[PDB]
């Protein structure tokens, strides 16, 4: 195809081993894009077109005034010398900025839609016994027209939602998929912690002399008593689904099962991929083939070399079932299917987020990597996407690093030196 | 909710007889026409009677004609179709359907039956043996582990499979019959699970071949 | 009696694109032509009669023209699950007769197929014959060259191929193969390989024992 195109296909061959050369030049690619504070990054893309979102913020990154939310989706051209940008095209603010949350976003036909939470209660997964169920879902052209009124941008009607035994659900996670009309946003269940079906010895704990057998059960929930407990999954959108078609929530399957939190499904290849934050004790990256998005079974990796930075409870590489709610969203992407060797950024240190790498890697090693910055350098949250140009694979990865986000282009090189 | 159900398809000998039944429900039967309308092997639709309401007045094509015979029962709400003499060119999956009014000629189906099998052969009915498909270790690529059933050597169709009787659908392919050199039908109906689940999920499939009275019930285990 | 000619005999369009089917009635039929979609193993669907008169609970996505001899189905925003046979029927009269078809394959982006191979069962071995089992799954496009060679042994006439009927959600096909081979056959032979060609596999892939 014609400049931007998904990852589908035979693309161009790409290093296939380990080895500590310089081979990854990362370009900074920020420049075409929104610069006070800026977090709740969300980078999706898609067929050649992105979505972004953040919410300006005055002062401090935890609890400053809320100035400004940016919905905004946009191209992804050749900038002029084979490299991949991110060139706005069409921006929605929110009249209220400090209403909307956990924004994702999923690309059909000419459409970004995305999905966001309204909540006048607060951040949802922090005061859910007092959130309403309510949900936002805005259309965005990603190419407008001159008059294109309702074209342009439209606030599609969240009237039903089917949620199961879950007594509210919500988007979690930056970018989702499409099958045929039907978009699967990524979301998370929230479960009266009564009703939770748990069989304690399942919580892997052998050679886990500090362990309990219950922890896993407890840390299913923000606190150990927590009123709900969070089951990541899908949001399901028919877009023929009549008028004003419903959201259905898909629980994810009990297979390595985990904490709710932040989470990515997108097409990698012809087929599905899944990843899910590590925001427990299980800190081993979470991520795989999806086998069926509905019932959603992924089949998860037995990945031992990579992880996120956590607290001193569940610090990175903790194996072990403990009480605990920290960690980062670092996603990864699928790049080759038949060797399963992906790229994501995640971060070179302990119990300290910091030291960005841009890291090419296999199950139980890492083929090459490549520092975005300094060891000094605090980063969080990192979400990557790639795909086609000129048949080579791409990468773009927002790294947040006071914080704003920062957009890198990685090429994935053929030869290994 | 209009239903209209066949019965009574099977295996009959080239210049044998039958009568099929649709039993409907959903409408009122007594004042609509009807119609039998058959699918040929190679899938070519073909219409075969029509009677009206009264079931006075009977229409035929020349290719049935004189050897079936459709009749209706407004009491029972049971429709029939007599066939005689029959040949291998009428093996074909028998439908019935309602017209759109009392009288018909000029008649769309808006509803059908399920169907009902009728094979005209000089062929004897055999049941089929089931053979687990073994999940090999070789299987896991990407964590997933696929299994299934072998319904093999079995005349005439068709054969039904379930998994754990119809709990698992998803990940299930029966897969059309095929028909072998030595005459008999062969399907294949695999699942493909998390290879994680092997071990401790069993996966009993449901085989039943109506016309033989088969049911087999052949645990997949790894 | 009334010939119907559909055209064309088979079609692949895109989830989004609009999609159109002809049919051509030997003699004049006024508006009494009707459309059905039928999947597989069950009953056609009614979809327009009276030309373009949609039926119950069909979506309006789906529109019929047409009067005297042509007519014609269209389905724009085309869906995964509008694949399948359209047959046009007419009803001006008895003997109904309809259109051989038009089978709608959906076109979706390329997914190159999951192989597992299956060994012969012990149960079927004490029979005295072994069949092997490959599975190609949920793969697209359909078209795929399934191949066993028994010992680098080119095999032919000894297998069957039966194809999964597009998904619903996703539209990919599977695929099993069947190499069937007699108890005696089946002692003689070393290699036992499962060689699978796609558009989504550069090489040739192959499960084997
Ligand atoms: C949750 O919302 C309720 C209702 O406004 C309020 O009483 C409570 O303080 C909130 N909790 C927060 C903001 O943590
Ligand atoms: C939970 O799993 C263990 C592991 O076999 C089992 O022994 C225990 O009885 C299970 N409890 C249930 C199913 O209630
Ligand atoms: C979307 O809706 C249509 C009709 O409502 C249905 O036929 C189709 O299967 C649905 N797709 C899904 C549920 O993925
Ligand atoms: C610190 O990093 C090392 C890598 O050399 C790792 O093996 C170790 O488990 C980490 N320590 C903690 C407490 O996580
Ligand atoms: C991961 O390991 C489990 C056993 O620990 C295995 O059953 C599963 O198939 C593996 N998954 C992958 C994708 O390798």
């Known amino acids: 195809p014609e400049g931007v195109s998904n990852l589908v296909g035979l693309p161009n061959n790409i290093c296939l081993q380990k080895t500590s050369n310089q081979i990854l030049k990362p370009k900074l690619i920020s420049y075409t894009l929104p610069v006070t504070c800026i977090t709740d990054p969300l980078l999706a893309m898609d067929e050649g077109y992105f979505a972004y979102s953040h919410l300006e913020r005055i002062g401090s990154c935890s609890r400053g005034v809320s100035k400004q939310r940016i919905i905004g989706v946009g191209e992804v051209l050749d900038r002029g010398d084979e490299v991949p940008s991110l060139f706005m095209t069409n921006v929605w603010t929110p009249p209220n900025p400090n209403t909307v949350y956990h924004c994702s976003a999923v690309y059909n036909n000419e459409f970004y839609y995305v999905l966001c939470a309204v909540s006048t209660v607060g951040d949802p997964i922090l005061n859910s016994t007092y959130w309403s169920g309510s949900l936002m879902m805005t259309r965005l052209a990603v190419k407008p027209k001159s008059n294109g009124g309702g074209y342009n941008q439209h606030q599609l009607a969240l009237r039903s939602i089917e949620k199961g035994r879950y007594d509210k659900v919500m988007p979690y996670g930056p970018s989702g998929i499409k099958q045929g009309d039907t978009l699967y946003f990524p979301a998370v269940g929230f479960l009266v912690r009564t009703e939770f079906k748990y069989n304690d010895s399942n919580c892997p704990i052998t050679k886990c002399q500090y362990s309990k057998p219950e922890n896993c059960r407890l840390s299913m929930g923000i606190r150990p008593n927590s009123h709900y407990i969070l089951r990541s999954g899908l949001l399901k959108y028919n877009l023929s689904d009549g008028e004003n078609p419903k959201v259905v929530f898909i629980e994810i399957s009990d297979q390595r099962l985990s904490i709710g939190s932040p989470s990515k499904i997108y097409d990698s290849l012809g087929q599905p991929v899944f990843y899910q934050a590590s925001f427990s004790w299980d800190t081993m990256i979470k991520f795989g083939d999806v086998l069926t998005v509905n019932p959603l079974v992924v089949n998860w990796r037995n990945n031992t070399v990579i992880s996120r930075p956590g607290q001193s409870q569940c610090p990175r590489f903790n194996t072990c079932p403990e009480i605990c709610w920290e960690g980062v969203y670092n996603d990864a992407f699928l790049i080759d299917r038949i060797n399963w060797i992906s790229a994501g950024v995640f971060l070179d240190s302990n119990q300290t987020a910091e030291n960005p790498v841009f890291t090419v890697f296999k199950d139980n090693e890492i083929l090459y990597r490549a520092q975005l910055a300094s060891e000094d350098t605090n980063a969080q949250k990192t979400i990557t996407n790639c795909f086609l140009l000129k048949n080579k694979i791409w990468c773009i990865s927002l790294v947040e690093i006071v914080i704003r986000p920062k957009l890198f282009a990685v090429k994935i090189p053929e030869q290994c030196t | 909710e209009v239903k209209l159900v066949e019965s009574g398809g099977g295996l009959v000998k080239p210049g044998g007889s039958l009568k099929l039944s649709c039993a409907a429900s959903?409408?009122?039967?007594?004042?609509?026409?009807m119609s039998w309308v058959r699918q040929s092997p190679e899938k070519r639709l073909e219409w075969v009677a029509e009677?009206?309401?009264?079931?006075?007045?009977?229409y035929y094509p020349d290719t049935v004609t004189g050897r079936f015979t459709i009749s209706r029962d407004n009491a029972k709400n049971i429709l029939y179709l007599e066939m005689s003499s029959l040949r291998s060119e009428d093996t074909a999956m028998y439908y019935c359907?309602?017209?759109?009014?009392?009288?018909?000629?000029?008649?769309?189906?808006?509803?059908w039956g399920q169907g009902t099998l009728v094979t005209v052969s000089a062929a004897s009915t055999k049941g089929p043996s089931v053979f687990p498909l073994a999940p090999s270790s070789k299987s896991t690529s990407g964590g997933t582990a696929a299994l299934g059933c072998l319904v093999k050597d079995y005349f005439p169709e068709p054969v039904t499979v379930s998994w754990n009787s119809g709990a698992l659908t998803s990940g299930v392919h029966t897969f059309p019959a095929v028909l072998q050199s030595s005459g008999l039908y062969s399907l294949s109906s695999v699942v493909t699970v998390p290879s994680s689940s092997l071990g401790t999920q069993t996966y009993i499939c449901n085989v039943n071949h109506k016309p033989s009275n088969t049911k087999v019930d052949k645990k997949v285990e790894p | 009696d009334i010939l119907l000619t559909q055209s064309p005999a088979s079609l692949s369009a895109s989830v989004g694109e609009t999609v159109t089917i002809t049919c051509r009635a030997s003699?004049?039929?006024?508006?009494?032509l009707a459309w059905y979609q039928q999947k597989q193993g069950k009953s056609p669907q009614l979809l327009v009669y009276?030309?373009?008169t949609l039926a119950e609970g069909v979506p309006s996505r789906f529109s019929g023209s047409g009067s005297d001899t042509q007519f014609s189905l269209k389905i724009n925003t085309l869906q995964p699950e509008d694949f399948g046979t359209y047959y046009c029927?007419?009803?001006?009269?008895?003997?109904?007769?309809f259109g051989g078809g038009t089978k709608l394959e959906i076109k979706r982006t390329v997914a190159a197929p999951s192989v597992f191979i299956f060994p012969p069962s012990d149960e079927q071995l004490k029979s005295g014959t072994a069949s092997v089992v490959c599975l190609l799954n949920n793969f697209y496009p359909r078209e795929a060259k399934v191949q066993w060679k028994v010992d680098n042994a080119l095999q032919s006439g000894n297998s069957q191929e039966s194809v999964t009927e597009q998904d619903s959600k996703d539209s990919t096909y599977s695929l099993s193969s069947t190499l069937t081979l007699s108890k005696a056959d089946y002692e003689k032979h070393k290699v036992y390989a499962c060689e699978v060609t796609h558009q989504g596999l550069s090489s040739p892939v192959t499960k084997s024992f």
């Open positions: 359907t309602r017209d759109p009014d009392s009288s018909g000629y000029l008649a769309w189906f808006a509803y």
């Open positions: 959903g409408f009122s039967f007594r004042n609509y026409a």
């Open positions: 009677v009206s309401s009264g079931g006075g007045y009977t």
């Open positions: 003699e004049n039929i006024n508006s009494y």
């Open positions: 009276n030309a373009k």
């Open positions: 029927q007419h009803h001006s009269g008895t003997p109904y007769t």
